[PDB]
DNA sequence: TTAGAGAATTGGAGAGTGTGTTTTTTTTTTTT
DNA sequence: CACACACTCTCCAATTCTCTAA
């Protein structure tokens, strides 16, 4: 079988290199080992816990931290911003067959798992994006101004022949142009074709527009903006007005409309998303770990917990203990209810 | 093989060469290699050291230095600028490869500053097309930065040969013969976006500056195009000197090609195969290779501070009674009011802003109010402060706009949608806002 | 293909026997053929529709219910044809002016818990879904052709009773008989039905926090 | 792909500026050799290894840092020889179908990469140190094998066509070939080549060293190379400025002629005219639409397009354009020519002719022989001329050898249709050698030595006494074809014919020379009347069309021969042709006509004779239209 | 259909060809000694016009290149020796 | 030995086919 | 739709290959 290697030395480009079978298999094995052997500072096997917390909720999406991927596997962190589409596909396959080792029946729940990269250190201001960043993984921040609805996009399309029953085999749909068959292999009729709507595989699609946050640099100047594409589970990760933090591949393609608008061979650009966080929702219950729950529930055992919480609100303000108490009660809030299913009363304070 | 070892194997060579442009190339390479500064040796070798950085690709060259090198060369560059410009870029590439750390695919650009003659916008006639030209104008609108395909790399779909360095002009042009000499294909090509080369691209609308505007005439506007390092350096409202060349840009919507189809009051030209039965119009665009203002951090301070400035600020720091010295120097027109001068000086120096452990800010800026009769020097203090300091703003309490001291919300008919017009305090962000007639605000601002 | 026609005929026969044989009740009280009697009374009233419960179909023949859940577009046509022929044998002989048999619309319902609009991901495509909501807009009733006849414009030959696919999807006219587009659709010799598009807003209870309500 | 990738990656890893080799790297390179020996016909392993850049990445560091490991080193040398093998040898011939021509181009591209990589001086430093040890040792089968493979590696790296799309480089910017030559100079392998050529102990390598030298000199020509003094850089700076100035002034003048040709009104400024005295293609008068300023210099083909001449009818074109090598490389190459001519020429050329006699040379190695016979002889003629350093090739044997080779190439050009262009390029080399021998026998008459004057008279007497050297020019002119031979061939042929006729004129006018070949009588003008043929004048006019682009010496030669053929032989009517008259019209209407005084005066002379004949009778206009045989005597 | 002219010997021996070329210079006049350039310009103008009338499809130089080859053929050559002298 | 007439091969001109194409109501913020 | 791009397909004829007479 294909033999293991030192990965970082090669004569090819990075994309070509990770596309070749030998290093692809080595990368696959390395990421598999990284998932199955990475540990926390305290020694907790991180990704066993994360995969269990994923498979419990059927979230079919595994979040990975770059700042420890670089710690464990160097060359994977090296190739990732340089050839992100290829390496992320390899990561998806490796993560899938790790998850099907931990939970063998999980293929009943989902046939594909996406690896989402977080805490990417090469952050970029939104107006500072240039041709130097093309086809590379970037991280940017901005307020979502617009969103399409969640729409079905073709991913693996089978075409019915225009004159007979035959289904032309799967074409992998792109984000650049609508892939087409040309002519049928069973009988070389050509031109228009019908999509087999039942056997064709679709994926969720949502296109968002993000611009610079109003208070960041737009001091009377107009803000710059970029389009981003969310696919599969990333849809509904954000709404208009959300101060998101977006990781994605900065991707470009030919656009005739821009060419005629500018009078130059100007290529449109879009961010193929790979992770969406929010800069106000810095913590969420879907991200809490077992250790966080354990130390929270240990703190609740203390009889001083009420006083600790009251003292913990705005600690740089002296006095105003009644204010801190009232703000704590409002910050935690009461319980909403609807007795009889016909009479609502609010829980908020 | 025989001594006649060349059947023209694999050759589609240039059967003729632009003599003038190549002479310009070699002589400009000699200029870059041999022109020397008075305080040392070989100025542009030292300036070309900076081009190994990932973001840097442009060398800024002084046209008067080129004239001091040779007048005939400078005249030829000025007269034949657009013709010779890619050859000058090749000369710079040949010059900068000796640093040995450059990527092989990296493009380099030449940018001529210090052009002696400045033309008005009215003088940009068709006779100026292709010539090196300097203009002054006020920027009106700046569009987003885009990647522009400078040269495509294409794959031939029926013999799998790659074709590199396909120059573009204006319509997106795929190659028109295959590089493989025996291959018959002239239409079926695929762009390799990853191995193609792009440059940063921006277009900005300028207009005639205030000094140049003729009496009783509408301001004339011009589309300037900036590339590579110049793609955000000029912002709307700035008065900037642009150097580059006036070019003609076709109506690209009218041109059909093997790459892409057409996309469809004056007559225009006719008769081209690519144009079909349509007619092609033209418009003038200033392709700016350089931009500068028309009149101009701790690391930045440490680099900028020359030895005289270091000694001056050190002597000032050790100056006893620097308090009264700075009060007198900053407010010489003011008689008396030493306490007020001291207070406003402390306002200029300001306190330390701080952030609490809970991510909540503590104010560092102080605020000073000067109450007085309309006959006194209260306005004089504000005028001296705003004349002195950079980034400061002067305003009345009453607003000269829909936005006042603080922002206001206004529709724009470009979208019929609400946006924020900035107020004086935001324009004075990280600075000083001098507010005369402070007692007579509107309720919104107050 | 004869194998395909055999499959369609077998599934149609199974739906036919479901509508012919399904009963509710007990031997202690009695039995009523629910869907037979519903078909008979609705046809005699001139209603020409019935409401087949998915749970009843599952109890009679679970495979039919599973097929109708996974591939409703394929199997609802067979179910409607089965209902048509069951109505024929249940109602005939009919009086004068009622000799021609009418098509039957087989609506269907379920006791299952419903899904939601935001739960409708891509993998739910072409399956049966059950979602709640509020109607915010309703189109005026418009005519959609279910069968058409097309006549060649040049030589006046005719192709008749071409079956139109249901839903908003259309039909591609042939480019061979003459010109490249030889045909026009005959406005008299075609059969049409009422159709109406609606907008179904997500329930306010179902909107996640901070979101605008979706609509389908 | 996978097995080849595993085996090549197995060799070694590179750390900064150092290379660390894995212990089984010898077996790894042996495996790579095994794969190369079992390629597909598409040269798939060569393509894949070139794509992987294993040569640059692994073999060059191994060569430059692990040459002490001799069993690895010789395997690495053989592997590099196999990888660098020229594409024409890899495929046997230049392909003619798209797929295999693409494969050829891909292999050629990787050869470009190899040539660019080998310019690193350490490679040739190691090669020169090794070959120095080997030639000190020189002797074993393995030793001479290693010498042969080192020389073949140098041959291979020198012999690649430069991809001038990427090597689109200006007048004296250092090309890849220039950098390779400079690396050879710095490594001192040029001294080893000089030692091999000068030494009599190992003459079997003389043929290979001749090939190496012939591949070293490709852009250069001896007349320019010999004149490169130490102060040439400042001179060329001023020359470049002057050339740019005159080019710009010429372009400005051309612009103003075009501007005055068209009017000062815009394009759609209408108005139409009738020329009452000029019939259209119909019966009515011509209606003209392009304005009075186009009528001022009216031509009846203003609106027309050129004709699409078919592929089989199109003329041949030059395969090269004269970019100079860098000035340092030019100085090194001049010094190499000096040392080669002084120390190496006679022994090496005798050894190569001995190789041809022994007939172990390859099928076209006499092309290299004739290349050197042209090049270094012309280098000797330039600057200080000394026949003593080059005495060997002045023998009449070389004239006979050139004549038989040239006639053989001529016959193969006329018969071998599929390879006719290459045979034309070989015939051009033979013609150039013949021209240079005519030049040197002309030159040595000016020398002060009576012995070499005696040798010159001997050579001239036997060469003009033997007829086959004399009739060859008529054969070449009679079967010259622009469709196969470039304009440089015709230029060299005209120059050679002018020189040969000049020397024959001088010899016959200073000595009797009364018999030729079995003796038969001979006079000079009888031979000159052979050139009074339609084909000869047609070819001369064909070269005359490019009078602006021709050198001043070429214009002097062509006008001198045509003036001789028209005036002294009294056959002006042979040169009366309408294409020739169009050429004269462009020549007389040239703004630069003052620079071509001899040409314009000759044109006016022949035109005056024509108009005398036309005044005699109207038949001259009809006779002017068609090329014409010996019946021209009616017109005269 | 396909009524494309060819410019072969039948075209050259037509009325517009050599029979016309025998006569086109009857109106012409020349200055002679010391003005051969002007006489050449008039000569080429007249024969260029004749070429245009004979076969308008080609440029003049291309027409000359065609005809200088085409004169070798026997039909036009016999018509040439008829035009030379007289029938 | 050189040049013209009959037969063979391939370029491309032309026919056919397929495809492409101000003005009113309602809201929101700010101007007086 | 009737008036323009883009592609395929057909037969005419333009130029060369080969045999013969001058
Ligand atoms: Zn089919
Ligand atoms: Zn191709
Ligand atoms: Zn019909």
Curated annotation (Swiss-Prot), chain A:
**Compartment(s) of residence:** Nucleus; Chromosome
Record PTM Phosphoserine, positions in chain: 213, 316
PTM annotation (N6-acetyllysine): residues:
48
The record's account of how the chain is modified after translation: Phosphorylation by the CDC7-DBF4 complex during G1/S phase is required for the initiation of DNA replication.
> Which positions hold the covalent cross-link Glycyl lysine isopeptide (Lys-Gly) (interchain with G-Cter in SUMO2)?
10
Q: Can you tell which superkingdom this protein's organism belongs to?
A: Eukaryota
Describe its assembly: Component of the MCM2-7 complex. The complex forms a toroidal hexameric ring with the proposed subunit order MCM2-MCM6-MCM4-MCM7-MCM3-MCM5. Component of the CMG helicase complex, a hexameric ring of related MCM2-7 subunits stabilized by CDC45 and the tetrameric GINS complex. Interacts with DBF4. Interacts with KAT7. May interact with MCM10. Component of the replisome complex composed of at least DONSON, MCM2, MCM7, PCNA and TICRR. Forms a co-chaperone complex with DNAJC9 and histone H3.3-H4 heterodimers.
User: Other comments?
Assistant: Early fractionation of eukaryotic MCM proteins yielded a variety of dimeric, trimeric and tetrameric complexes with unclear biological significance. Specifically a MCM467 subcomplex is shown to have in vitro helicase activity which is inhibited by the MCM2 subunit. The MCM2-7 hexamer is the proposed physiological active complex.
As for family, the record states: Belongs to the MCM family.
Protein name in the entry: DNA replication licensing factor MCM2
| Full-protein residues shown | 169 to 517 of 904
Curated annotation (Swiss-Prot), chain B:
User: Which effect does the record note for changing residue 156 to Y?
Assistant: Found in patients with microcephaly, developmental delay, typical facial characteristics, endocrine disorders, feeding difficulties and urogenital anomalies; uncertain significance; impairs cell proliferation and ciliogenesis
Q: Where does ATP bind?
A: 335, 375-379
MF-aspect GO terms = ATP binding; ATP hydrolysis activity; DNA helicase activity; identical protein binding; single-stranded DNA binding
Q: Which residues carry this modification: Phosphothreonine?
A: 266
Q: Which UniProt keywords apply?
A: Acetylation, ATP-binding, Cell cycle, Chromosome, DNA replication, DNA-binding, Glycoprotein, Helicase, Hydrolase, Nucleotide-binding, Nucleus, Phosphoprotein
Q: Quaternary arrangement and interactors, per the entry? A: Component of the MCM2-7 complex. The complex forms a toroidal hexameric ring with the proposed subunit order MCM2-MCM6-MCM4-MCM7-MCM3-MCM5. Component of the CMG helicase complex, a hexameric ring of related MCM2-7 subunits stabilized by CDC45 and the tetrameric GINS complex. May interact with MCM10. Interacts with TIPIN. Interacts with CDT1. Interacts with MCMBP. Interacts with DDI2.
Q: What else is known?
A: Early fractionation of eukaryotic MCM proteins yielded a variety of dimeric, trimeric and tetrameric complexes with unclear biological significance. Specifically a MCM467 subcomplex is shown to have in vitro helicase activity which is inhibited by the MCM2 subunit. The MCM2-7 hexamer is the proposed physiological active complex.
Organism the protein comes from: Homo sapiens
Curated annotation (Swiss-Prot), chain C:
Disulfide bonds, paired cysteine numbers: none
The record's subcellular location field reads: Nucleus; Chromosome
Grouped into one coarse class, the protein's main location is: nucleus
Q: Which UniProt keywords apply?
A: Acetylation, ATP-binding, Cell cycle, Chromosome, Disease variant, DNA replication, DNA-binding, Dwarfism, Helicase, Hydrolase, Nucleotide-binding, Nucleus, Phosphoprotein
- Known disease link: Meier-Gorlin syndrome 8: A form of Meier-Gorlin syndrome, a syndrome characterized by bilateral microtia, aplasia/hypoplasia of the patellae, and severe intrauterine and postnatal growth retardation with short stature and poor weight gain. Additional clinical findings include anomalies of cranial sutures, microcephaly, apparently low-set and simple ears, microstomia, full lips, highly arched or cleft palate, micrognathia, genitourinary tract anomalies, and various skeletal anomalies.
Q: Its biological function?
A: Acts as a component of the MCM2-7 complex (MCM complex) which is the replicative helicase essential for 'once per cell cycle' DNA replication initiation and elongation in eukaryotic cells. Core component of CDC45-MCM-GINS (CMG) helicase, the molecular machine that unwinds template DNA during replication, and around which the replisome is built.
Q: Does the keyword Acetylation apply?
A: yes
A Gene Ontology molecular function term for this protein is: helicase activity
At the highest ranks, the source species' classification is:
Eukaryota, Metazoa, Chordata, Craniata, Vertebrata
Name this protein carries in UniProt: DNA replication licensing factor MCM5
Q: Which GO terms describe its cellular component?
A: chromosome, telomeric region; CMG complex; MCM complex; membrane; nucleoplasm; nucleus
Transcription as a keyword of this entry, yes or no, is no
From Swiss-Prot, chain D:
Gene Ontology CC terms: chromatin; nucleoplasm; nucleus; replication fork protection complex; site of double-strand break
Ion transport keyword on record: no
**What does the record say about tissue specificity?**
Expressed in all tissues examined including brain, heart, lung, liver, skeletal muscle, kidney, placenta, pancreas, spleen, thymus and testis. Highest levels of expression in placenta, pancreas, thymus and testis.
> Which molecular function terms from Gene Ontology are attached?
DNA binding; enzyme activator activity; identical protein binding
- Annotated region Required for homodimerization and for interaction with CRY1 and CHEK1: the residues are 1-300
Q: What induces it?
A: Regulated by the cell cycle. High levels in S, G(2) and M phases, with highest level in S phase. Low expression in G(0) and G(1) phases.
Domain of life, source organism: Eukaryota
The modified positions for Phosphoserine read 272
User: Its Gene Ontology biological processes?
Assistant: branching morphogenesis of an epithelial tube; cell cycle phase transition; cell division; cellular response to bleomycin; cellular response to cisplatin; cellular response to hydroxyurea; circadian rhythm; detection of abiotic stimulus
Q: What subcellular compartments does it reside in?
A: Nucleus; Chromosome
What are the entry keywords?
Biological rhythms, Cell cycle, Cell division, Chromosome, Developmental protein, Disease variant, DNA damage, DNA repair, Mitosis, Nucleus, Phosphoprotein, Transcription, Transcription regulation
The main location is nucleus
Q: Which residues form a coiled coil?
A: none
Comment on protein domains? Residues 1182-1199 comprise a putative nuclear localization signal; nuclear localization is required for the regulation of period length of the circadian clock.
Which family is this protein grouped under?
Belongs to the timeless family.
What's the protein here called? Protein timeless homolog
Organism, by scientific name, is Homo sapiens
What gene, per UniProt, encodes this protein? Answer: TIMELESS
């Amino acid at each position: 079988e294909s033999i293991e290697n030192l990965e970082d030395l090669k004569g090819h480009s990075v994309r070509e290199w990770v596309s070749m079978a030998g290093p692809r298999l080595e990368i696959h094995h390395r990421f598999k080992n990284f998932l199955r052997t990475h540990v926390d500072s305290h020694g907790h096997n991180v990704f066993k816990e994360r995969i269990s917390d994923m498979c419990k909720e059927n979230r079919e999406s595994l979040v990975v931290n770059y700042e420890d991927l670089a710690a464990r596997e160097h060359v994977l962190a090296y190739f990732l911003p340089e050839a992100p589409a290829e390496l992320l596909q390899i990561f998806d396959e490796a993560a899938l067959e790790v998850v099907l080792a931990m939970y063998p029946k999980y293929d009943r729940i989902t046939n594909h798992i996406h690896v989402r990269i977080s805490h990417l250190p090469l952050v970029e201001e939104l107006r500072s994006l240039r041709q130097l960043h093309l086809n590379q993984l970037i991280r940017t921040s901005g307020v979502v101004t617009s969103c399409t609805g969640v729409l079905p996009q073709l991913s693996m399309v089978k075409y019915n022949c225009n004159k007979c029953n035959f289904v032309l085999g799967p074409f992998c749909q792109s984000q650049n142009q609508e892939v087409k068959p040309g002519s049928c292999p069973e009988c070389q009729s050509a031109g228009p074709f019908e999509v087999n709507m039942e056997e064709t595989i679709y994926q969720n699609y949502q296109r968002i527009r993000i611009q610079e946050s109003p208070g960041k640099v737009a001091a009377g100047r107009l803000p710059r903006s970029k389009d981003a594409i969310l696919l599969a589970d990333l849809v509904d990760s954000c709404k208009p007005g959300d101060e998101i933090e977006l990781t994605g591949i900065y991707h470009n393609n030919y656009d005739g409309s821009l060419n005629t608008a500018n009078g130059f061979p100007v290529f449109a650009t879009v961010i193929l998303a790979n992770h969406v966080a929010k800069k106000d929702n810095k913590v969420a219950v879907g991200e809490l770990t077992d250790e966080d729950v354990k130390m929270i529930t240990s703190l609740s055992k203390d009889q001083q917990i009420g006083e600790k919480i009251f003292a913990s609100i705005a600690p740089s303000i002296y006095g105003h203990e009644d204010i801190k108490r009232g703000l704590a009660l409002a910050l935690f809030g009461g319980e909403p209810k609807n007795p009889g299913g016909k009479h609502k009363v609010r829980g908020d304070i | 093989l025989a001594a006649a070892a060349e059947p023209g194997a694999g050759s589609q060579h240039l059967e003729v060469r632009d003599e003038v442009a190549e002479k310009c190339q070699k002589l400009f390479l000699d200029f870059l290699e041999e022109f020397q500064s008075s305080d040392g040796e070989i100025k542009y070798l030292q300036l070309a050291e900076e081009l190994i950085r990932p973001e840097r690709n442009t060398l800024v060259v002084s046209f008067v230095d080129l004239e001091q090198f040779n007048q005939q060369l400078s005249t030829t560059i000025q007269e034949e600028f657009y013709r010779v410009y890619p050859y000058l870029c090749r000369a710079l590439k040949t010059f900068v490869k000796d640093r040995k750390e450059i990527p092989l695919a990296k493009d380099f650009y030449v940018a001529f500053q210090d052009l002696p003659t400045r033309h008005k916008i009215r003088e940009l006639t068709s006779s100026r097309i292709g010539l090196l030209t300097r203009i002054s104008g006020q920027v009106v609108r700046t569009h987003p930065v885009h990647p522009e395909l400078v040269s495509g790399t294409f794959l031939c779909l029926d013999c799998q040969t790659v074709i590199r360095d396909v120059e573009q002009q204006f319509k997106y042009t795929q190659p028109n013969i295959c590089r493989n000499p025996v291959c018959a294909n002239r239409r079926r090509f695929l762009l390799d976006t990853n191995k193609s080369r792009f440059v940063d691209f921006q277009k900005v609308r300028i207009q005639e500056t205030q000094a140049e505007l003729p009496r009783g005439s509408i301001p004339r506007s011009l589309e300037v195009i900036l590339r590579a390092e110049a793609v955000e350096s000029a912002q709307a409202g700035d008065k900037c000197d642009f150097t580059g060349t006036l070019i003609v840009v076709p109506d690209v919507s009218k041109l059909s090609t093997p790459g892409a189809r057409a996309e469809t009051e004056t007559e225009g030209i006719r008769g081209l195969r690519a144009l079909g039965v349509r007619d092609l119009s033209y418009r003038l665009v200033f392709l700016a290779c350089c931009v500068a203002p028309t009149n101009p951090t701790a690391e930045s301070i440490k680099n900028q501070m020359t030895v005289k400035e270091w000694e001056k600020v050190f002597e000032m720091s050790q100056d006893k009674n620097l308090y009264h010295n700075l009060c007198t120097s900053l407010f010489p027109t003011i008689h008396g009011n030493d306490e007020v001068k001291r207070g406003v000086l402390l306002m200029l120096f300001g306190g330390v802003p701080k952030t609490t452990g809970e991510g909540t800010s503590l104010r560092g800026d102080i605020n000073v109010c000067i109450v007085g009769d309309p006959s006194t020097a209260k306005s004089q203090f504000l005028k001296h402060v705003e004349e002195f300091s950079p980034r400061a703003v002067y305003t009345s309490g009453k607003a000269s706009s829909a936005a006042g001291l603080t922002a206001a919300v206004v529709r724009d008919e470009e979208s019929h949608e609400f946006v924020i017009e900035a107020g004086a305090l935001m324009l004075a962000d990280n600075g000083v806002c001098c507010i005369d007639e402070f007692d007579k605000m509107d309720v919104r601002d107050q | 293909a004869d194998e395909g026609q055999a499959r369609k005929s077998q599934l149609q026969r199974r739906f036919k026997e479901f509508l012919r044989q399904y009963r509710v009740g007990t031997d202690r009280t009695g039995f009523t053929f629910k869907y037979r009697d519903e078909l008979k009374r609705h046809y005699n009233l001139g209603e020409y529709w019935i409401e087949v419960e998915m749970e009843d179909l599952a109890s009679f023949d679970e495979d039919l219910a599973d097929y109708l859940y996974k591939q409703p577009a394929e199997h609802l046509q067979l179910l409607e044809e089965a209902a048509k022929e069951v109505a024929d044998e249940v109602t005939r002989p009919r009086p004068s002016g009622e000799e021609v048999l009418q098509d039957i619309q087989v609506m269907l319902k379920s006791d299952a818990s419903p899904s939601s609009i935001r739960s409708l991901k891509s993998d739910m495509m072409s399956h049966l879904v059950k979602i709640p909501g509020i109607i915010i807009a309703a189109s005026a009733v418009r005519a959609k052709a279910t069968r058409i006849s097309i006549q060649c414009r040049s030589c006046r030959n005719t192709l008749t009773n071409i079956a139109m696919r249901p839903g908003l999807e259309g039909y591609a006219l042939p480019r061979k008989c003459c010109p490249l587009d030889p045909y026009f659709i005959m406005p008299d010799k075609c059969k049409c039905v009422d159709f109406q598009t609606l907008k179904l807003q997500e329930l306010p209870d179902a909107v996640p926090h901070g979101e605008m309500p979706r609509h389908m | 792909n996978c097995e080849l990738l595993a085996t090549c990656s197995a060799l070694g890893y590179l750390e900064g500026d150092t290379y660390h080799k894995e212990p089984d790297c010898l077996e790894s390179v042996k495996d790579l050799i095994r794969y190369l020996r079992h390629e597909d016909e598409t040269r798939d392993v060569r393509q894949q290894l070139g794509a992987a850049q294993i040569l640059q990445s692994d073999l060059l560091p191994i060569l430059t840092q692990h040459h002490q490991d001799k069993p690895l080193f010789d395997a690495v040398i053989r592997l590099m020889v196999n990888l660098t093998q020229p594409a024409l040898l890899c495929f046997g011939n230049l392909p003619k179908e798209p797929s295999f021509r693409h494969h050829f181009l891909q292999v050629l591209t990787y050869l470009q990469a190899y040539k660019e990589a080998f310019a690193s001086e350490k490679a040739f430093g190691v090669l020169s140190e090794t070959l120095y040890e080997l030639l000190q040792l020189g002797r074993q089968e393995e030793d001479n094998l290693l010498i042969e493979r080192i020389l073949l590696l140098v041959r291979n790296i020198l012999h690649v066509p430069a991809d001038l799309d990427q090597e689109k480089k200006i007048d004296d910017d250092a090309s890849a070939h220039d950098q390779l030559l400079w690396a050879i100079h710095l490594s001192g392998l040029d001294d080893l080549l000089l030692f091999l050529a000068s030494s009599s102990a190992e003459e079997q390598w003389s043929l290979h060293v001749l090939e190496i030298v012939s591949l070293m000199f490709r852009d250069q020509n001896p007349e320019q190379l010999a004149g490169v003094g130490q102060g040439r850089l400042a001179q060329e700076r001023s020359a470049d400025f002057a050339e740019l100035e005159v080019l710009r002034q010429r372009e400005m003048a051309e612009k103003k002629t075009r501007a005055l040709q068209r009017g000062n009104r815009h394009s759609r400024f209408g108005g139409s005219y009738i020329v009452q005295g000029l019939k259209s293609i119909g019966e009515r008068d011509l209606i003209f639409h392009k304005g009075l300023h186009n009528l001022r210099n009216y031509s009846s083909d203003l609106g027309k397009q050129p004709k699409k001449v078919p592929k089989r009818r199109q003329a041949a074109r030059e395969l090269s354009i004269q970019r100079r090598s860098a000035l340092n490389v030019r100085l090194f190459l001049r010094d190499f020519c000096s040392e080669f001519l002084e120390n190496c020429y006679n022994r090496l050329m005798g050894s190569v002719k001995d190789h041809l006699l022994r007939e172990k040379a390859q099928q076209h190695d006499e092309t290299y022989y004739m290349w050197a016979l042209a090049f270094f002889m012309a280098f000797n003629r330039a600057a200080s001329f000394r026949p003593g350093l080059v005495s060997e090739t002045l023998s009449v044997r070389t004239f006979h050898f050139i004549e038989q080779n040239l006639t053989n190439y001529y016959e193969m050009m006329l018969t071998d249709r599929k390879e006719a262009a290459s045979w034309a390029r070989r015939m051009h080399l033979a013609l150039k050698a013949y021209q240079e021998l005519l030049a040197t026998v002309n030159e040595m008459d000016i020398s002060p030595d009576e012995a070499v004057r005696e040798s010159s008279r001997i050579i001239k007497n036997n060469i003009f006494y033997v007829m086959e050297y004399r009739e060859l020019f008529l054969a070449l002119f009679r079967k010259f074809d622009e469709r196969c031979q470039p304009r440089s061939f015709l230029r060299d042929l005209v120059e050679t014919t002018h020189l040969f006729l000049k020397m024959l004129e001088r010899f016959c006018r200073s000595r009797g020379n009364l018999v030729v070949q079995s003796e038969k009588e001979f006079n000079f003008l009888d031979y000159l009347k052979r050139f009074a043929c339609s084909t000869v004048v047609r070819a001369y006019v064909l070269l005359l069309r490019s009078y602006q682009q021709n050198s001043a010496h070429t214009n002097h030669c062509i006008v001198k021969m045509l003036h001789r053929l028209a005036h002294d032989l009294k056959m002006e009517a042979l040169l009366f042709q309408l294409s020739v008259f169009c050429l004269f019209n462009r020549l007389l209407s040239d703004p630069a006509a003052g620079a071509y005084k001899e040409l314009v005066t000759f044109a006016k002379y022949i035109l005056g004779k024509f108009f005398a004949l036309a005044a005699v009778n109207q038949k001259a206009f009809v006779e002017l239209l068609f090329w014409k045989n010996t019946a021209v005597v009616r017109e005269m | 259909k396909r009524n494309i002219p060819k410019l072969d010997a039948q075209r050259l021996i037509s009325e517009r060809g050599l029979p016309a070329l025998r006569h086109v210079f009857d109106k012409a006049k020349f200055k002679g000694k010391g003005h051969e350039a002007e006489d050449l310009k008039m000569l080429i103008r007249h024969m260029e016009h004749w070429a245009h009338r004979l076969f308008p499809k080609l440029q003049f130089e291309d027409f000359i290149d065609r005809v200088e080859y085409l004169g070798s053929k026997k039909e036009v050559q016999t018509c040439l020796k008829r035009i030379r002298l007289d029938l």
